[PDB]
Write a protein that binds this DNA or RNA. Structure first.
Ligand SMILES: [Cl-]
Ligand SMILES: [Cl-]
Ligand SMILES: [Cl-]
Ligand SMILES: [Cl-]
Ligand SMILES: [K+]
Ligand SMILES: [Mg+2]
Ligand SMILES: [Mg+2]
Ligand SMILES: [Mg+2]
Ligand SMILES: [Mg+2]
Ligand SMILES: [Mg+2]
Ligand SMILES: [Mg+2]
Ligand SMILES: [Mg+2]
Ligand SMILES: [Mg+2]
Ligand SMILES: [Mg+2]
Ligand SMILES: [Mg+2]
Ligand SMILES: [Mg+2]
Ligand SMILES: [Mg+2]
Ligand SMILES: [Mg+2]
Ligand SMILES: [Mg+2]
Ligand SMILES: [Mg+2]
Ligand SMILES: [Mg+2]
Ligand SMILES: [Mg+2]
Ligand SMILES: [Mg+2]
Ligand SMILES: [Mg+2]
Ligand SMILES: [Mg+2]
Ligand SMILES: [Mg+2]
Ligand SMILES: [Mg+2]
Ligand SMILES: [Mg+2]
Ligand SMILES: [Mg+2]
Ligand SMILES: [Mg+2]
Ligand SMILES: [Mg+2]
Ligand SMILES: [Mg+2]
Ligand SMILES: [Mg+2]
Ligand SMILES: [Mg+2]
Ligand SMILES: [Mg+2]
Ligand SMILES: [Mg+2]
Ligand SMILES: [Mg+2]
Ligand SMILES: [Mg+2]
Ligand SMILES: [Mg+2]
Ligand SMILES: [Mg+2]
Ligand SMILES: [Mg+2]
Ligand SMILES: [Mg+2]
Ligand SMILES: [Mg+2]
Ligand SMILES: [Mg+2]
Ligand SMILES: [Mg+2]
Ligand SMILES: [Mg+2]
Ligand SMILES: [Mg+2]
Ligand SMILES: [Mg+2]
Ligand SMILES: [Mg+2]
Ligand SMILES: [Mg+2]
Ligand SMILES: [Mg+2]
Ligand SMILES: [Mg+2]
Ligand SMILES: [Mg+2]
Ligand SMILES: [Mg+2]
Ligand SMILES: [Mg+2]
Ligand SMILES: [Mg+2]
Ligand SMILES: [Mg+2]
Ligand SMILES: [Mg+2]
Ligand SMILES: [Mg+2]
Ligand SMILES: [Mg+2]
Ligand SMILES: [Mg+2]
Ligand SMILES: [Mg+2]
Ligand SMILES: [Mg+2]
Ligand SMILES: [Mg+2]
Ligand SMILES: [Mg+2]
Ligand SMILES: [Mg+2]
Ligand SMILES: [Mg+2]
Ligand SMILES: [Mg+2]
Ligand SMILES: [Mg+2]
Ligand SMILES: [Mg+2]
Ligand SMILES: [Mg+2]
Ligand SMILES: [Mg+2]
Ligand SMILES: [Mg+2]
Ligand SMILES: [Mg+2]
Ligand SMILES: [Mg+2]
Ligand SMILES: [Mg+2]
Ligand SMILES: [Mg+2]
Ligand SMILES: [Mg+2]
Ligand SMILES: [Mg+2]
Ligand code: NA
Ligand code: NA
Ligand code: NA
Ligand code: NA
Ligand code: NA
Ligand code: NA
Ligand code: NA
Ligand code: NA
Ligand code: NA
Ligand code: NA
Ligand code: NA
Ligand code: NA
Ligand code: NA
Ligand code: NA
Ligand code: NA
Ligand code: NA
Ligand code: NA
Ligand code: NA
Ligand code: NA
Ligand code: NA
Ligand code: NA
Ligand code: NA
Ligand code: NA
Ligand code: NA
Ligand code: NA
Ligand code: NA
Ligand code: NA
Ligand code: NA
Ligand code: NA
Ligand code: NA
Ligand code: NA
Ligand code: NA
Ligand code: NA
Ligand code: NA
Length: 237
RNA sequence: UUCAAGGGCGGGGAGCCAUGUGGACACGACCCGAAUCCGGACGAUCUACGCAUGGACAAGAUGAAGCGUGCCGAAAGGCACGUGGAAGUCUGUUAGAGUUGGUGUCCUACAAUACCCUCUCGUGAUCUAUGUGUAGGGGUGAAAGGCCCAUCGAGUCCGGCAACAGCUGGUUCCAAUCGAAACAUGUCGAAGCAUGACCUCCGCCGAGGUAGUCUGUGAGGUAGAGCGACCGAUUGGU
RNA sequence: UGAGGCGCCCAAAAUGAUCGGGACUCAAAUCCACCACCGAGACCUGUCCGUACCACUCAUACUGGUAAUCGAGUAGAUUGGCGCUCUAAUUGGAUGGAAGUAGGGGUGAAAACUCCUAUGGACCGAUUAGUGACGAAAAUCCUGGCCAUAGUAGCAGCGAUAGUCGGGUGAGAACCCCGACGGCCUAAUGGAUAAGGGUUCCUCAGCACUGCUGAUCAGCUGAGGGUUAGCCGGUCCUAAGUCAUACCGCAACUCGACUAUGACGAAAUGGGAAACGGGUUAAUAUUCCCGUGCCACUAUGCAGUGAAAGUUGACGCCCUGGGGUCGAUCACGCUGGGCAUCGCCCAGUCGAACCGUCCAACUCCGUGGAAGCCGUAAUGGCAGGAAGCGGACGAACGGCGGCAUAGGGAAACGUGAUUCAACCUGGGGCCCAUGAAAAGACGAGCAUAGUGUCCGUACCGAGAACCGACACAGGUGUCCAUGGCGGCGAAAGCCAAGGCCUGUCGGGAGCAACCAACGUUAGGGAAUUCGGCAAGUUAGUCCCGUACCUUCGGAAGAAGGGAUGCCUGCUCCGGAACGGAGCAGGUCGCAGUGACUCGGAAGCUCGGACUGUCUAGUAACAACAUAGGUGACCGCAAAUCCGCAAGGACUCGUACGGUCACUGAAUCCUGCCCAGUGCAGGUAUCUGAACACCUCGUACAAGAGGACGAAGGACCUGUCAACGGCGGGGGUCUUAAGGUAGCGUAGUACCUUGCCGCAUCAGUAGCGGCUUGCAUGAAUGGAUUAACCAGAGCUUCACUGUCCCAACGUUGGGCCCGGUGAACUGUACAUUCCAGUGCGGAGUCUGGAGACACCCAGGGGGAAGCGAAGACCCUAUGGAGCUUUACUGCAGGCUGUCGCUGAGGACUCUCACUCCGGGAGGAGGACACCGAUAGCCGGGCAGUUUGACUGGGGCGGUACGCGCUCGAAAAGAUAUCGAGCGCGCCCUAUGGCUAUCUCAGCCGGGGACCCGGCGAAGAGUGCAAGAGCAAAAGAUAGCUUGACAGUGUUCUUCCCAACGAGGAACGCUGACGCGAAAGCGUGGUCUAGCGAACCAAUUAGCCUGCUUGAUGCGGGCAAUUGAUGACAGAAAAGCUACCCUAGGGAUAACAGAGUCGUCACUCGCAAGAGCACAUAUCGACCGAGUGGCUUGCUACCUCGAUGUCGGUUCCCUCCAUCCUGCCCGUGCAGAAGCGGGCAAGGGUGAGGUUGUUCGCCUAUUAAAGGAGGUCGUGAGCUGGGUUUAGACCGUCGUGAGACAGGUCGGCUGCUAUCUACUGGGUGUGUAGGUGUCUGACAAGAACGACCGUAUAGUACGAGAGGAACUACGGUUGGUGGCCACUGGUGUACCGGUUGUUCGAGAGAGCACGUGCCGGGUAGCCA
């Protein structure tokens, strides 16, 4: 047959790429020699085309002007701080060690200095539960308990834009406009609506998948489609 | 080979080379004939989808939120009027896009997809110019196996290549002699082969042969007939 | 009363009857005899030829002889010869004329040889031996040329119908030019341009080419000429993105991703230093000239120390205010023009860049001090300080002044206003969407001077300059969107400016038929049709008014009702409009949205929620998408995906993410099943590879075995919004459950037109109810649903030429004429018709009939017409796409092991290595990554296979290897999917031998046993069938292992007649058994019970392995065992309607043909009933037939195609007669019937459901018959159904996909050569003329039928009821003709009237070939 859509994706052609040239900034925690002295002032609040969420423009003491992953509650004029000795207020960034347990956090680093990897989408947040000299236990938005180096930096507060998912798109056109700002091919044709040559579920006198939808983890690309290594399906039980 | 016996193969000197010619096998193999498969290249001037930068949409209708005023109310708010001008909203041959019916005209066309009337959309998932990206078992696809330059259930060009076929077509001067088989055995075999039958030509052998009839010595259970001769059918009566 | 001969009845078919025809009757028939003739290539006979043989011979050279016993022939075998090229030897010809060609003479059976004459003008042979790109009628053969076709089609069709009269030039003028008149184009047919073209531009000279005709013209031909830039573009910048170098990869590169660097990337249409006005050429022009202005750089000078922060460049979508120019319009004046019943109408009234100046909006400052005011179109603003007042900053392509006694104008060379494109500047709203960048500019003064190079520049820009082969009705971007009237309008219609008469052939006929577009049609009004297809109706605006339903938005312009012009005078809103809304009065028409523009409406059902997408080119839909619902995977060093690698997309992303799937808005809901399959988790035990390890083996090694055991599997569990399932039976079984809410004859229901109801005269339709559902059902989503829809079905009102039933007219063709000028097609012949025959579908054969030739027009009956090597079907050891638990492999994932890899069955560490960090350092860590290998998964991908037989193929079957009886025709052989039926073993005895013995069955005496008797065989002998057997081949007893080893002969397998395995018969050699012995035993009494090579194992001995010896382990001779049943041996599944090729009428579907079981009809006999009575009527059984309409069979004809069903239209026919005429019988009173005979003249109609044929139903009727003509009729129509590609449902399948199931959508080519006929001409024959006739023959349905009245309330009859002859009147169908009458048309004509233009008036053009409306003569018509 022919390569399935999931395979056309990997080639990285225009249709599947994100409109990167249209994006604003790569949100990452600033690098501080040490001391924490680094502070800056919020100069403006902008829309982030790559996240459909707000982002904050900050002017730092040493002249640096960078966009920041903005938590909820940050406004023009506010003074944000980044460092070990940073105050403990929303919008500030400091290592999980210096953060008091029980505080909501966002843009958490996977490993100290990577600039932030977890909890960055609209309205989400991580939960610093346990401390230690060796391990900082954080509960990610998926609900997982993650063990992180207490040296991993994070930002106090929940990400701005919460509740975005509460409103329905209502019409195809609205999805369209959002999809145009992401690295995604849309709309989506169902596999069962295709021909056998184009998809493992394609073909037939009526529409239905050929075999069962749960596919093995070991299935090769071109065949791994449907419910991937599903531990279970449906809702019952 | 073999206790043994019995079998197999060979044996009393003709070959080698040359020239012409009959035939076989490999090769293009008497000639043409088609759908393939594979390799390397050339194409996104068409078209699909994405991206960059530009452009386009008479006029009218309906009248969302918001806001105002007035009246009612303790408040909550409610009601009326106005304002406001939303919408993959309506009408619309504005421009522009599309293409339902006529199964009209055309059908050696004006045209290898045209003409006319009718019809759908026309502020949006909109239409469009130019630039730009994705390339062949690969793209692209709101998915019709659609589209990738009149080419698509795997583009185009050249090459492999004089592809192969048991299948169709064709195979060019005169005469004399003989003269079939359309059957049997085997076959992935029944549109084909091989081996026999049968046709023909050459060399050898050297006296019988037997298509006809008669007679003699033998073989035979079909026609017919019959079954108180088997067998099995098949009537009635004392 | 028996028999015979000939005939008769029985006896019906489709274009025109037949015995071949004519025609024949004491025969030209038939039967019995007879006589004479005709008549082949046979037979006889003369001569010759060939072939074979004989004599002679070297001879196959002669000569003679023989053939009664020689003379046909496809495929094929054999043999002699003719012709072509060039070579060689030998030898000739030719300018006193070679070859070739044309015509002609001679020879040879012939291939072919040769001569003569003409032409030709230089080469040409013969013999012998060679040579070979050596011989054509054919291949839908190749190339070239040519005829018919044909002076034919086209040069008409398009909403752009375009010309005409004079004149100019010229050899020549319908189309080249001038004038007038008449028209066409208005977002274009005008103006400016991008791309693209490339000289097409201008001039002169031309017409052989091109130009749909002609041409003096030209985009043609030839020759010259033409494009001028500091301030228009390029150039410069950067965009998506591209390239180059470096690095790395790769076997390698012209290959490849990342990361650096550098460069490239925008001519209309991104950003951007600077130009305006006039003038000029045949052709350029912000480029040249004149005038004026401006920018940048550099130099000089003065000023200036400032100078880089910031601003700008620089930005989305929607609504909106203000500023404001051009344009347009209004008022008034001036200048010029037009008109001439008024006094109107038209044009103009000008003047740049630039320099200077002015400034609304926004923002801000001071003052002020609002507690309710301020302000807007709207939102809004304020004690955090409103209004007012004063001030800073601050706009136009705008105002104003200069520029300008510049320029331009014949002249005047204006002033105000409104609405205001451009341009400027604000306010508001929206985003799960956030709307470039860089160069550059500003910031940052002035004088003077110098410099400003390089590339582009013509023209077209399209119904002739571009792409489409063309001067192609197609395609192709931007700007002018502000010309007038009109009106909502960038709409229509009309008209300016500007352009054009080149969407480039004309002339003629009242101009016929027929065709394309189209107008109008009385009365009826969907009767048409699959279906209202097509056409029509409605229509603009205002007022009134508006149902069910609903997601409260909508439905809605629902529906329905009314109004609408002009003129006179006014009112209101507003600053006003040349803006809008009203009032009163007058008044005309058939009609006031008067043309134009401009909805028909309502209801029920199905589907998909909606806008959107799609098969470029037959499908626009119910299919795809969608929001919404849901499940799955993943914490980012992730999940998913691309790459061989280096690397990469997702990702400037991070679970409110994004990947992978299913369902498909809302509403109410979404039951039961985990057995199978899938996925996932767990797992004592079982299974589970390689390395390392242990044992055996080998001086080593191969190899055998063990221990350990990863993933995986077994096993257990979870999971269905995972694949999917939800029955039979009874008051459980398969296999887990056993169909819940719902819905239901469904787009799913076979039976089926289900039943009931609604509706209609009538309704296979539609809707509602019922519903046992062939075979409904819950995210394979169920039900339901407002809104929406070029989606499917149905109903109503309205409408109407769809129909009854057609007519007239309009325009373009058609027809005739000038000019231009193809194609298709062609074996030949061809004036055919009716029959027959033939490979069964003939212009050509046969018999007849008809037929004088040529030509014009026509509609297409035939040439199984032309077009296409059939798409259907089968066949091929064909192809391809697709599928899967087909075969075999290959990626990829998981997992063990080895290397990298290090220190001290579980553990720590750090040093490689990996990741994070700028670094310091942090995390991880001998793991991971990578390299190698092993096991598991693995249609993700590749290559292939998937057999044959067969009354086509498939399904079924196996007649695919064997044995018997019959078929089988008394030797042998013999077919079918022929009839009956068996074998793929079983047996250590059920083998072998010997001894003893005789069986079934019946009878008699004491179904066991005992005795006797009869008893040739019916018993028994393993198993089919047939055969054999009695002191045995059977039974009993005993003994024995010959069911032995080796090797042959022969037959069979395979008749004849080659062929293996296998089988059998009969020997021998050896060894045995039994018997006194002869002898028997080569398994079972005989015919079924069977298997190659390669490989392995096994048996006994021997041969052999590369210089050699020893050991190990191999190779071989003979043979046994292991299976290929498709059985003389491949290792092997499907779909294709997305399909493709080779072929086949070797083979199916359709038509034909044969048959006639089936079907239709008839006859013989006549049981029977019919109150009695076979035969008024009905009529069984059985028997004999006819037809060729149904069905089936067959496979003859066509697969290089004979176009399907149904319908329609138009023609002919048959009779087995439905009506009509004439008759017979009656269970015939009459009337009304029933049945029958003759008979085919005429008639046999209209409708409702259905694609239907058929059939059901309704009302009429004299009756509403059946059948043939290729199931008549697609070069006639239609296209509803069957049967392409799209899709849905049900069922089946793991799946692709399928269905003798349903459903929505889904194309109709061609210019007529021949023939045929309808009509029209020209000739010839009869044999100069006029007029009038004749009539061989030919055609007709020219007439068919019904109702009514008198007869008559009569005959008949109890009555009820109720005829006839004849004479009349009328109707219907058909037929021919005609137009006084009625009616239609009537783009002759006359009137009314809307819009616009000619100034008004008058009078006119256009509005599609009449603007519309009203009337309508002639003619033509019903
Ligand atoms: Cl999303
Ligand atoms: Cl000869
Ligand atoms: Cl230019
Ligand atoms: Cl405003
Ligand atoms: K055929
Ligand atoms: Mg980032
Ligand atoms: Mg919305
Ligand atoms: Mg995208
Ligand atoms: Mg979808
Ligand atoms: Mg599909
Ligand atoms: Mg597949
Ligand atoms: Mg579905
Ligand atoms: Mg489904
Ligand atoms: Mg392009
Ligand atoms: Mg309003
Ligand atoms: Mg709309
Ligand atoms: Mg519209
Ligand atoms: Mg493009
Ligand atoms: Mg398909
Ligand atoms: Mg010959
Ligand atoms: Mg001869
Ligand atoms: Mg016999
Ligand atoms: Mg007999
Ligand atoms: Mg002969
Ligand atoms: Mg010689
Ligand atoms: Mg031939
Ligand atoms: Mg002709
Ligand atoms: Mg005209
Ligand atoms: Mg010219
Ligand atoms: Mg000239
Ligand atoms: Mg550049
Ligand atoms: Mg520009
Ligand atoms: Mg010019
Ligand atoms: Mg020019
Ligand atoms: Mg033209
Ligand atoms: Mg009428
Ligand atoms: Mg009807
Ligand atoms: Mg009808
Ligand atoms: Mg219609
Ligand atoms: Mg007023
Ligand atoms: Mg009208
Ligand atoms: Mg239905
Ligand atoms: Mg839809
Ligand atoms: Mg199409
Ligand atoms: Mg459509
Ligand atoms: Mg279509
Ligand atoms: Mg759908
Ligand atoms: Mg969804
Ligand atoms: Mg979803
Ligand atoms: Mg019903
Ligand atoms: Mg369910
Ligand atoms: Mg064919
Ligand atoms: Mg087929
Ligand atoms: Mg294949
Ligand atoms: Mg790194
Ligand atoms: Mg495959
Ligand atoms: Mg192959
Ligand atoms: Mg077969
Ligand atoms: Mg015999
Ligand atoms: Mg025997
Ligand atoms: Mg083998
Ligand atoms: Mg063995
Ligand atoms: Mg065989
Ligand atoms: Mg055999
Ligand atoms: Mg074919
Ligand atoms: Mg045949
Ligand atoms: Mg035909
Ligand atoms: Mg009769
Ligand atoms: Mg008749
Ligand atoms: Mg027919
Ligand atoms: Mg007929
Ligand atoms: Mg026909
Ligand atoms: Mg046709
Ligand atoms: Mg035709
Ligand atoms: Mg149809
Ligand atoms: Mg239909
Ligand atoms: Mg249909
Ligand atoms: Mg004559
Ligand atoms: Mg007119
Ligand atoms: Na499927
Ligand atoms: Na192939
Ligand atoms: Na392109
Ligand atoms: Na309101
Ligand atoms: Na159309
Ligand atoms: Na390909
Ligand atoms: Na080739
Ligand atoms: Na082949
Ligand atoms: Na044969
Ligand atoms: Na055969
Ligand atoms: Na064959
Ligand atoms: Na003899
Ligand atoms: Na006989
Ligand atoms: Na022959
Ligand atoms: Na002309
Ligand atoms: Na106007
Ligand atoms: Na729309
Ligand atoms: Na299960
Ligand atoms: Na399961
Ligand atoms: Na079901
Ligand atoms: Na639509
Ligand atoms: Na008409
Ligand atoms: Na014809
Ligand atoms: Na294919
Ligand atoms: Na096979
Ligand atoms: Na044998
Ligand atoms: Na018959
Ligand atoms: Na044919
Ligand atoms: Na028909
Ligand atoms: Na008749
Ligand atoms: Na009917
Ligand atoms: Na036919
Ligand atoms: Na047709
Ligand atoms: Na038809």
């Amino acid at each position: 047959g022919r390569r399935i859509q999931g395979q056309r994706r990997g080639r990285g052609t225009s249709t599947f790429r994100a409109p990167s040239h249209r994006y604003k900034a790569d949100l990452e925690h600033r690098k501080v020699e040490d001391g924490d002295v680094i502070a800056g002032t919020v100069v403006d609040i902008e829309h982030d085309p790559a996240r459909s969420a707000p982002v904050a423009a900050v002017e730092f003491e040493d002249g640096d002007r960078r966009l920041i992953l903005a938590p909820e509650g940050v406004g023009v004029g506010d003074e944000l701080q980044v460092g070990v000795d940073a105050e403990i207020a929303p919008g500030n960034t400091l290592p999980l060690a210096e953060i008091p347990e029980g505080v909501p956090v966002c843009n958490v680093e996977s490993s100290p200095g990577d600039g932030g990897k977890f909890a960055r989408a609209s309205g989400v947040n991580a939960q610093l539960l346990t401390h230690d000299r060796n391990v900082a236990v954080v509960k990610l938005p998926s609900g997982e308990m993650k063990r992180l180096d207490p040296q991993c930096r994070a930002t106090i507060g929940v990400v701005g834009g919460g509740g975005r998912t509460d409103k329905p798109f209502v019409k195809a056109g609205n999805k369209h406009h959002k999809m145009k700002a992401r690295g995604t091919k849309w709309p989506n044709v169902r596999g069962v609506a295709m021909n056998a040559v184009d998809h493992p579920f394609g073909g037939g006198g009526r529409q239905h998948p050929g075999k069962p939808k749960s596919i093995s983890r070991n299935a090769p690309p071109g065949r791994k489609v449907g419910d991937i290594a599903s531990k279970r399906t449906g809702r019952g039980g």
